[PDB]
């Protein structure tokens, strides 16, 4: 079934964006390096 | 805490009475045919049973099965080891044979601790 897979994928991406924008992720380090 | 032992006798027919075993072991393979065996908890074997009944008083047995899947009871099918048993969810079905009696299939799980 693709509907459950799609729902799980979007939820996982929503959690991933918060776990990456927090302390330690690539985007956080990139922003810290650039803006400073 | 008025427990009620299962009644209406027992019978074996149409693949009924077969037991089932469930374990809780985890093992990891190292290499060269080496393995490590471990168990979480106390390594209890949750026995399972299937019962098929046909008789005149099928309605009372159906009522008992429907009303006793939340609270446990006692029932000793093959050997006399008394156990704390409870009916599985959505595992009760009826088959018709005659205008007076019916066929009922139920499955039992063994519960440990709690007892209420």
């Amino acid at each position: 079934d693709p509907r459950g897979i799609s729902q799980g994928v979007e939820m996982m991406f929503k959690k991933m964006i918060r776990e990456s924008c927090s302390q330690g992720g690539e985007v956080y380090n990139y922003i810290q390096e650039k803006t400073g | 805490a008025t427990l009620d032992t299962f009644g209406w006798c027992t019978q074996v027919q149409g693949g009924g009475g077969s037991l089932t075993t469930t374990n809780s072991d985890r093992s990891i393979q190292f290499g060269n045919g080496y393995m490590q065996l471990a168990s979480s908890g106390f390594n209890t074997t949750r026995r399972e049973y299937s019962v098929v009944y046909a008789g005149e008083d099928f309605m009372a047995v159906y009522d008992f099965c429907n009303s006793h899947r939340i609270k446990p009871f006692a029932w000793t099918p093959p050997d006399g080891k008394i156990g704390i048993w409870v009916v599985k969810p959505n595992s009760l079905g009826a088959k018709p044979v005659s205008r007076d009696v019916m066929e009922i299939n139920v499955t039992f799980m063994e519960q440990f601790t709690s007892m209420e």
């Binding site: 810290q32 | 985890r26 190292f30 290499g31 060269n32 080496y34 490590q36 471990a38 979480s40």
Partner: protein, 808 residues
């Protein structure tokens, strides 16, 4: 160039005072108490240069250390005043001050000059200089001279001057006295009277600002005609929690560190990291929870942080020091990691440890073999190509430019032979010395080249090793094809213990390695191997018993174990649970030695700029010149001085004797000529100015007197003629000779017998006249005449000789 100013401290003339007050905030918490003027800076220029002199003259300041029990700063005097009235005398020492109110803070005294002038016999007008003092008393004291003020000038309308006096802490009462320190004048024409007409006293402000360090600076307003200067200090800073057996100055270690803490000053980043992680006001445990920090690891970090290692120009020095100041709000993680980057030590865990481990030449702790991982398998991965660098750029806070940023690159030659140029940029976080920046750069340069990560997953053994423990790997795959790595054994201590491996022959090497449940792995020399059955006998002796089916490893000189550093451990659920994923990186046992001996830096050379003290003119001379125009005499005023380096445009200013300074317009000729200056007494001083605008100090007062017309000698009048042919009248002729165009009159003396004792004055004729007839003679009477010249400035001339007369 440098900012302009002018030191003004010698107030003695009629001039008002305007002051500026600035109060600065210093780091939170307790600070050292060393606030000397040599450590206070204006525009990165020190105020007092050692012994030297004063760069910015006349500065008043006071400082506080920043504790709970401070005392309020007596500056910022506000909230009006009271002001009484009285005007008695300041000659025979009257007047007293009898304040009792303990809330009183300061007292202002205003002094009045009704008339100050002075005259001479010639009628010229000069000034008068007078001296006063102000004295405290205190309960039973010597009156403690405090304030000294000078007043001069020529006045006809009055002069006001209000001064400020600060009270000392007392118990019952304070007495102030007003005294005069010059002899009092007389009825002679010298006017000098002192009047005091003020009792301006008031509280100032009771704002002592507890828990914060302070700084109060006072100066005058004339000194800066442009942007005010940035104020800074150079001194020690926050008092940190220092261990017991530790002397910060001498960097000693008594031994047996027992956990007791004291308070002192330190630069070791090990102890100013612990201070940040525990402070409740501005630290890490803000939500009133006592967090746990491993003190022993920090003590070992401190011990490593003070090893003596020379570099640069010899002179062994500590290898890591940190002295930083924080002025902007940043995320706590950024600050913590920036501070930790000095160690380059790992940090981890959340609840029970909060620990830091420095990279040291550590010893192995646990053994992992092909029989202690899942699917007997190890994975190998590496770093990207862009991560291998050759040069790194490091920022600075340099000492010799006085905390201005600089650049020092770090480069390794060997890495440049294969890759090319890969450049980084790392901002240093407080290294004030160039050598430590180079060491920090070489740290990353050396560690980035060697990175061969090896990963694997194990069973319950993962609970034993933690992050930072160096582990040993005896993988068969990377060690060619020979194995010598199983988990058999059949005996405990028996002596070579048969040690029958159920399969695999294994061969002869140096030592066999066992894993003890708690302690470090133990290696014993595998001698008398006796591999007759190829699988019998290994060792000589052993300690403690050993379980069967235990792990072991064998090493050789040609093939040995591989050391790695554990960095991450992970856990599973519901199918893995008891497994533990582990990763590791390649260990390096010799990079520190290469780091400690690979830096070379000479110094920061000096530069050519304007000096902070422009020299004053060396010597000054005052002379004159004369010329004769329109009968009268005209003088001139001449000044000169040596051309002093670092000085463009001069300044000349002079008065009569004491009255009031007047400014001669700015000149660059190095010499000043002013004509038509009237006779009297005069004084001259000359400053110096540079291109920027910074004016130097005042010169030495040079006084001169202008008598008149260069001095010069008069010239006697020639050819006095006496004749004897005029009936009834006696006459006389003459000739006023050259340079006599300033004659005020001639002097005519007439003796009767050529004796100078018998010569008497007769008449005094006008300059536009040379002849004289004197009719009242008798016949044949003989007379004599003497004639001289007097000039306009009443300068006389030598008498002539005596000529004879004979009437008809």
């Amino acid at each position: 160039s440098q900012k302009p100013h002018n030191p003004v401290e010698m107030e003695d003339n009629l001039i008002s005072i305007n002051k500026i007050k600035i109060l600065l905030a210093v780091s939170d918490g307790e600070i050292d108490e060393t606030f000397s003027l040599k450590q206070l800076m204006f525009n990165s220029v020190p105020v007092q240069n050692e012994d030297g002199s004063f760069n910015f003259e006349g500065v008043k300041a006071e400082f506080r250390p920043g504790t709970q029990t401070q005392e309020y700063i007596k500056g910022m005097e506000d909230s009006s005043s009271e002001v009484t009235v009285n005007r008695e005398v300041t000659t025979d020492n009257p007047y007293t001050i009898s304040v009792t109110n303990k809330t009183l803070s300061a007292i202002r005294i205003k002094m009045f000059m009704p008339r100050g002038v002075r005259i001479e016999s010639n009628g010229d007008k000069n000034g008068v200089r007078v001296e006063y003092e102000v004295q405290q008393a205190v309960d039973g004291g010597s009156f403690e001279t405090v304030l000294t003020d000078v007043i001069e000038g020529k006045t006809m309308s009055g002069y006001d001057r209000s001064r400020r006096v600060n009270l000392p802490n007392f118990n019952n009462q304070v007495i102030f006295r007003v005294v005069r320190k010059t002899p009092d004048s007389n009825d002679s024409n010298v006017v000098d009277a002192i009047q005091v007409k003020s009792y301006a006293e008031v509280i100032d402000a009771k704002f002592r600002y507890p828990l914060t360090g302070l700084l109060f600076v006072e100066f005058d307003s004339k000194m800066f005609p442009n942007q005010l200067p940035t104020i800074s200090i150079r001194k020690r800073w926050k008092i940190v929690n220092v261990p017991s057996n530790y002397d910060p100055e001498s960097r000693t270690y008594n031994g047996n560190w027992d956990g007791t803490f004291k308070k002192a000053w330190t630069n070791n980043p090990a102890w100013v990291l612990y201070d940040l992680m525990i402070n409740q006001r501005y630290g890490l445990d803000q939500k009133e929870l006592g967090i746990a920090v491993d003190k022993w690891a920090l003590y070992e970090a401190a011990q490593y942080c003070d090893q003596m290692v020379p570099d640069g120009k010899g002179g062994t020095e500590p290898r890591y020091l940190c002295d930083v100041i924080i002025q902007s709000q940043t995320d706590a993680y950024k600050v913590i990691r920036d501070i930790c980057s000095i160690f380059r030590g790992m940090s981890f865990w959340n609840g029970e440890s909060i620990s830091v481990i420095i990279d040291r030449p550590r010893e192995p702790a646990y053994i992992f073999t092909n029989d202690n991982v899942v699917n007997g398998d190890f994975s190998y991965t590496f770093a990207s190509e862009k991560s291998m660098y050759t040069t790194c750029n490091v920022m600075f806070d340099d000492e010799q430019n006085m905390y201005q940023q600089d650049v020092e690159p770090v480069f390794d030659r060997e890495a440049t032979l294969r890759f090319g140029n890969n450049v980084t940029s790392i901002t240093a976080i407080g290294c004030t010395r160039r050598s430590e920046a180079n060491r920090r750069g070489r740290w990353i340069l050396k560690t980035n080249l060697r990175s061969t990560t090896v990963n694997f997953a194990t069973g319950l053994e993962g609970m034993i090793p933690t992050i930072g423990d160096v582990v040993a790997i005896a993988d068969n795959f990377w060690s060619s094809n020979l194995t010598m790595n199983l988990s058999g054994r059949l005996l405990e201590v028996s002596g070579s213990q048969i040690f029958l491996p159920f399969r695999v022959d294994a061969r002869a090497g140096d030592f066999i390695i066992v894993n003890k449940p708690d302690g470090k792995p133990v290696k014993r020399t595998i001698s008398s191997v006796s591999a007759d059955g190829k699988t019998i006998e290994v060792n000589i002796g052993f300690g403690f018993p050993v379980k069967p089916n235990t792990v072991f490893a064998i090493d050789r000189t040609d093939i040995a174990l591989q050391q790695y550093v554990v960095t991450k451990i992970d856990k599973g659920d519901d199918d893995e649970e008891f497994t533990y994923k582990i990763t590791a990186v390649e260990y390096d046992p010799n990079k520190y030695d290469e780091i400690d001996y690979g830096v070379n830096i000479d110094d920061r050379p000096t530069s050519i700029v304007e000096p902070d003290q422009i020299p004053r003119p060396k010597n000054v001379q005052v002379s004159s010149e004369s010329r004769i125009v329109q009968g009268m005499s005209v003088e001139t005023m001449i000044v000169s001085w040596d051309k002093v380096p670092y000085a463009v445009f001069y300044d000349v200013q002079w008065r009569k004797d004491n009255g009031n300074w007047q400014n001669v317009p700015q000149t660059a000729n190095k010499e000043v000529y002013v004509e038509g200056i009237y006779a009297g007494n005069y004084q001259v001083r000359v400053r110096s100015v540079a291109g920027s605008g910074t004016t130097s100090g005042w010169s030495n007062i040079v006084a001169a007197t202008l008598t008149g017309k260069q001095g010069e000698p008069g010239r006697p009048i020639n050819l006095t003629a006496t004749d004897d042919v005029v009936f009834g009248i006696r006459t006389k002729w003459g000739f006023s000779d050259g340079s006599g165009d300033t004659a005020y009159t001639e002097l005519q003396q007439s003796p009767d017998g050529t004796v100078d004792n018998a010569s008497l004055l007769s008449l005094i004729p006008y300059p536009q006249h040379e002849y004289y007839h004197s009719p009242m003679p008798g016949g044949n009477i003989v007379w004599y005449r003497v004639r001289t010249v007097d000039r306009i400035g009443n300068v006389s001339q030598w008498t002539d000789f005596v000529r004879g007369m004979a009437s008809t």
